[PDB]
Symmetry: D2
Subunit: 264 residues, 4 copies
Amino acid sequence: MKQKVVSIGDINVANDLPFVLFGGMNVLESRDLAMRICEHYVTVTQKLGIPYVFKASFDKANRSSIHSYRGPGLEEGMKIFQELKQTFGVKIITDVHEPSQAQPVADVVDVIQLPAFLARQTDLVEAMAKTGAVINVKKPQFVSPGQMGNIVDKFKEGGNEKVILCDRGANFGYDNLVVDMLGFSIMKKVSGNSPVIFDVTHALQRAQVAELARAGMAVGLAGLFIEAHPDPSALPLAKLEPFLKQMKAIDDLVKGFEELDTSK
Amino acid sequence: MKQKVVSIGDINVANDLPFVLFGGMNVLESRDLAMRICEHYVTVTQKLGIPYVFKASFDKANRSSIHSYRGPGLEEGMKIFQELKQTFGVKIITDVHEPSQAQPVADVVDVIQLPAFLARQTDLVEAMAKTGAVINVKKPQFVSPGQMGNIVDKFKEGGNEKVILCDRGANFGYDNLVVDMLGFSIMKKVSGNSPVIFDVTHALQRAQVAELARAGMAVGLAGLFIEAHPDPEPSALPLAKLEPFLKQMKAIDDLVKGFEELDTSK
Amino acid sequence: MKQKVVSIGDINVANDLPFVLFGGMNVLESRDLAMRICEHYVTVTQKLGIPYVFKASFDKANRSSIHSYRGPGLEEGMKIFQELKQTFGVKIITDVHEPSQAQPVADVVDVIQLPAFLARQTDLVEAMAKTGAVINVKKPQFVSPGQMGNIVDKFKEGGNEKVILCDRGANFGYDNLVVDMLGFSIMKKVSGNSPVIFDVTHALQRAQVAELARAGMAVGLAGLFIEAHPDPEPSALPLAKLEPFLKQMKAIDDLVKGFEELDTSK
Amino acid sequence: MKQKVVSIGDINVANDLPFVLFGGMNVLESRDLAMRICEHYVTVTQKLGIPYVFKASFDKANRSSIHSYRGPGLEEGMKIFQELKQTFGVKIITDVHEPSQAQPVADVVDVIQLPAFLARQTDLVEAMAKTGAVINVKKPQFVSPGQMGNIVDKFKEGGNEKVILCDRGANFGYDNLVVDMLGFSIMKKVSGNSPVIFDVTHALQRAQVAELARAGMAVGLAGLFIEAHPDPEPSALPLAKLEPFLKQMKAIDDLVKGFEELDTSK
């Protein structure tokens, strides 16, 4: 069966298409860092020729203290995304933490994503499906890949079929994650060949980003979620280019192989 | 350090006190079902002499289908709760899912619960803590017992020191839970010896509910959390077996709680 | 189906019989230490009415370096066991690691133990089985409880139906073990109800020995496996704490074995 | 530090060298099938320029039943390997299961393999080490990658520094294996950069040998281990697909090995 294609503007995400890079930073901690980081991404994607989408969060709804920096907020944040939309013309992506935010954000941004922990809360879901916008579902660390279909079905019944499944690792004992490279195809098959991407940045939680990422891309994915930072979990900003080069070389190579049926 | 006593009216919850039963049903299906389930917990706990708090959700915030049944809602649910208090005089525990529900629910209820999935959502914790109500934290299947101090602290900074921690199992590979009996103490240690209880019915994988519950109770806990149903077709104890089940629990609890202090470190 | 009974001289091991204690020390460090430890176990179990089998390893065949202390070796180790038998009349359990050790060791001890890592080695199982001795199988940390029936079948194939199954924890991520209290019944179920014991000392990947041991005993087991040491410097129980520890175990076992059947599945 | 190089005849194995293929069949079922499968591996690797070592077992030491087919055994097995050497000039790798088997097997074979369940048995390691042969260690499903250093050190104390490390999965809950792609570097790091290969066929939990193999190969490894069979009916690549499969592996390896150095740490 054909691979499902989900379009984010002029960009086309699908499992058998050049991978798409949903990359950016953790949180919009400043308009200067957001501007700075965003630019570096666009010029490199530009140069390398990789479908791109800027990603950043306007709020960290799950930090360990009520008094520890939360972020820009919904209002000030959409402003920063607006002048990024204007300055660089980049497609945007960010996570929503409550139904009430599904619409405000939905217009200002191109892709809204369902946090892992809140990935089963039906209300947040329906408000997102309502929106009709492109959605990035972050697979919970605690749910099997063979379960992702149901979340896809929930959005369908909620009137939205612009869903992208992002693996972000699986629980492996206490305080630790492992990435099941075989999960991708399972999410793939249980969701009408929906497009699957891979958030290497969170599945780590450094020296291994490269290895983890190559491994995933080698499997054959629709995209790659990632975060960077000039002075850092995140990829040092400067290395974004060699990184993507490797990533694109592997993607082009794997997307090029002809079908290989190892079942028989 | 002595054990932390969290009070629910005249009921005291603590790791070295007789266990408290946080028991009920999954969701407030009908007034009749809630009345029948509540009634049986009430007479059985009275007969056995076990402190009791009735549980039921007014809303199922995460069922697989957008259209599947999800309870009477906040409004009707609170009414059913007031009626249960008018009829039985029972303490009540229910879980909240949005910051706004925290206060109206605490106005009716005796213990508000923090769903496992939203255990790290600081806005809910904030709102819940602000009510000053006794809190029951469902430990995520995905966080280690050692990480529970932060949540208890988050409530502390929010003005609330009436937090009870509840184990409900831990992820073990794909779609499977295992209960780490060693985690109870860790949660005690990392939280000023806050009361620790065990949700045997969600941690379940059944004729195994008793074995897991016995194991948990033998460790020595502040309480037990379980759901039951007259006819079980998220697992439930059959209502009619409540009594012989609790008989085993109380016997194990009284025995273990009466044990002379024992340190095996040295 | 009736519980399977495995006997060791005047002792009988079964899931519905008072628990049997397979206790001792890790390795036969010195005959003096073995004597001292063994005397204390006999006195205490004798005084409490607990069936007892003394355990110690003559060799630690799977350490880190080729030079780490491995014990006194087979020959010298048998010497010590003999002296322990003559001096105290104790039954003995020890592990064997190669096919050619099974018979010489069975000639001296009452129970031969199949190490966890070697539980699937066909030649070792057959040599052990032909011996006709009582067998204690350490369940592999990496095999699910539902898989233990095959090991019992293999032993029967080799003429031996005196197999005891012993849980010693399951892999939980890296370098960690968790004890699945629900695994005890599964092992029972897939093995024709073979006796199931719990090795609490190796399950502790501690001041948590009593807690984990209580949890397991409360499930209702055929026995307990434990190691102790005068000065603990894997995680041994302090020798002087043996008595208070066993009073808890017997108390929990008598209570639990004393309960009437309770089916919570219906 | 430089990558450690282990040589096998006119072959060199190292993490920064083109990958080596340790491939063949599971057990030496018959002389005919062994011939047929070896022929095809040689033909295909010869054509693609992939260093190659033929794999097959002379004994399956850990099947479910004592009576099920184990293979031809050590004597008959070495004879078959001999014919392979003479007929095809291939290098050979096989596993050994008892200490006494190491020497006579290393006298015929080029690489001896230490089974995962036995990787920590000191006497087997010592006997294998003393033969002076090239060693392939199957990493236990139950040992963390960071623990592979001790195994390598044990071989060294035994006078053997020709050790290759083979990942074959990590236990993930019950009856499941997950491959940790981050483990390869850990193994590399704690073992003085010993060569690291990947057994994709035993790491399969069906028809996705290709993507698991690709992912591992993309990490950058010293080699790949695989089994195949004319009719597959753990897993086993279908023979006829060997070429297309190896073609992708060689393509990814050349690409990745060709990359400049990328430090994502700063």
